Each structure stands twice: as C-alpha cells, then as structure tokens.
Amino acid sequence: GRATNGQFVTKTAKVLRYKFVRWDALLIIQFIDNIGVMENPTFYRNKSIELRSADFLSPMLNNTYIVPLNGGVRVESPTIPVQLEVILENNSSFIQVGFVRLTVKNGNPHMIIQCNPVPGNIKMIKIKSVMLFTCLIG
Amino acid sequence: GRATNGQFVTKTAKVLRYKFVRWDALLIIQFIDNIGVMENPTFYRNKSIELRSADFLSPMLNNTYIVPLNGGVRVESPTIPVQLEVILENNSSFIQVGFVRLTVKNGNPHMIIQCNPVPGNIKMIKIKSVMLFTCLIG
Amino acid sequence: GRATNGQFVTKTAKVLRYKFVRWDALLIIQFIDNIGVMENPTFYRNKSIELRSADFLSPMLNNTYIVPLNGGVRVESPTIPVQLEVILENNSSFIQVGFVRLTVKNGNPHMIIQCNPVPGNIKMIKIKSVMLFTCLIG
C-alpha cells in the first residue's frame, strides 16, 4: 500500500504525527514532525521532537522516561537509537545517544526513552533524529 | 506472510529465539527473548539477552566478540546499534552502545558484537535492546 | 521484487555502491561496499566507506558533514546510527557513534553525517558499519 497518516497525543496534548504502512505481519512507522532539511546549499537544520517534563510518568527510574500516549497504532517495536538533547532545569544540556521503543500498556501506547545519567532534573528531552520503527505484528 | 518462529543455539546450548518474515529479497528478523514490558503503570523493565564468555570465540581482537551459532537463518545483515551491559570478571559493569551484525562463515551463522574497550576481562555481555534486522537477500 | 544494483558518486568521483528494493511506498536501500567478513574462523574484518575532506561541503557547522551526491535514488530517509572513525589532519583518530540520513536538495541526493566534536580538522571519516535505510516514499 501507500503511506497513511496518523498521530499520537501526549498527556499535555502535544501531537506526534507519523506516517505508516501496514502490510501485516509488518508495520513500518515513521515520525514526521522533525524531518530535517537543507535550508540552503550548505546548511542542514535538524528539527526536534520536543518532549517536556509533564509528558513523562513519575517517578522516573534508571534513566527511563515514559511517555504515555493516546490514539495512534499499538505496537511492541524494536529499540532504535536516536540523537537526544537532554535539557536540565538549569538550562544546561547534554547530547546523547538515546534508545527508543514503542510498547503497549493497558491498551495504551507508550514511548520508552532511555538515556544516560545527567547532573540535575530534566526539563526537556529533544529527539533530533528522524525516527522510523519496523515492527513485527503477531 | 505472517511471522514464523525460529531460533539459534550457542556453543553452550543457549537458545536465542526469534520471529521472522521472509518476502525475498527481504528478510526481517526480530529476537524475541528480551522484549521489555511495563510491569505496572509506571515501571519499565528491560530484559537481557545474556551471552557468556564461553559463547564467544577465542582470541578476541579489537573489541569484537564473535558468537558462533547453529541453526536459524543465514544472513549478511546490516549493523544495528544496541544497548549493551558488559560485565567484567571483577563484576564491574559498563553500559555501552554496541554494534551487532549477523554474518555467515563456513555455512554457519555468526553474531558479531562490537563495543568499546573495558578495563578487564569480560565475563558477560547483556543485550538490553530489542533487536530487529532488516536484511537484503541476494 | 529482488534486489537491484545502483550507486551514488561523490564530488571527487568516489562511487558508493548500493542494492535496493522498491515496493512503493517502501524503499529499502543497503550500501554494499563495506560488508565485513570473517576472513578465517576467528577473525572479523570491518570494512570502511571512506569519505575525504573534499567529498564534504564547506563551511561545516555543528559537527555536520554534508556529502553532495550524484545519481542514485532520491529519498528522505530516517536517521541511522553508525560506527565512525574520524581521522584528523594530524592522523589522530576518534571512534564515534555517527548519525546518517539521506536527504534531497536541489533535486540532488545528499548524505548527512553528524558526529561529536573533535580537537582538530578532519581529513577523513570512515563508516565502519553496514548501512541499510528503510524509507517511506510519499
């Protein structure tokens, strides 16, 4: 088939747009809000999916941030590594390889984001990578 | 098609279970032993594929650990990055981005795991990521 | 379908060979120049895609190296993480997780390679990973 639109919504009503192709047992899904572009012949701008403190579950354990989501598709994806920027409350920031999965809990999709220790509380995580998950359904 | 079960077996008779879809020229394969879950509404448990010293070939060179495998499918996959925990003989442990491929040697599948230097001998490598390889056959 | 050959060419006339499968809306493309092999029963050799200074655009900003390409397919891929070795002018070298995308600018394909700061000017970037992109067309 051709690519169908969809979205997830966060606790704070942020909308995470994606396109997907469902060929069961295969579901391939890309997030489309942050597709970077060359804005002129020599400059590449990255774009961020920006997730705030209030998008995550509390308490956070083991550098694992859980984003409960509503709507969208319901998959147990593999883990994909991403470029993260972790913004601390003191506006200090750390660039990291993050690891992202989609999982299902209580019939709800959740995005699992795992990263490294940071010296402070997190205000914001920015995903600077274009994320695509290839998933096996059943 | 829908997802078919399979497994690889290690030198020490550890069984590495996967599901795959074969649409030649495409083979997509996920390892399924360590699919993490949210065990309650706020906690995500990672699971490990645990590979011991005796699962690897000797001598090890250039932080490259080779796991000879029996059975399963026979692919030259791309490289996927993973979350590793490298357990040293002194039970010290290091969290790392590893890079994994499947390759074929002497008609046998081998899993290639590459990581960073550690200050000691390795007792165990745990893969904490859900691994899926998309492969091109011929 | 089965896997079709193709290539991209760099500013300096380096040829980057790939195989792909196009099932629109899906395009899956692997680079094939650097498929590593076990050369004997205990040794795995990585192979590099070697990109020189003159393959990149100037000026470089924010550890982002842009490789303008000619020919090949024209995709907005997701980001894939890779093993990089960054060779400096003083022949010092740094092993890094890089992040690679294919993007389109002025109807031309460009490879976007992003990595970490290095203490010097870059002479060469080697991609030691086998790269495969799964892409969504339209």
Author numbering:
A (entry chain A), B (entry chain A), C (entry chain A): 317 to 454
What does the paper say about this structure?
A complete and highly redundant X-ray diffraction data set was collected on a crystal grown from protein derivatised with selenomethionine, at a wavelength at which the anomalous signal of the selenium atoms was maximized. The data used extended to 2.2 Å resolution. Solvent flattening resulted in an easily interpretable map in which 137 amino acids were automatically traced. The asymmetric unit of the crystal contains one protein monomer and the biologically relevant trimer is generated by the crystallographic three-fold symmetry axis. Manual completion resulted in a model consisting of 138 amino acid residues (317–454), one phosphate and 47 water molecules. The phosphate ion mediates a crystal contact between Lys421 and Asn422 of one monomer and Arg368 and Lys439 of a monomer belonging to another trimer. No density was visible for residues amino-terminal to 317 or for the purification tag. The head domain appears to start at around residue 317, rather than around 304 as predicted.
The fibre protein interacts with the host cell through its distal, carboxy-terminal, head or knob domain. We compare the structures of the virulent and avirulent fibre heads, and show that, in both cases, the head domain can bind sialyllactose.
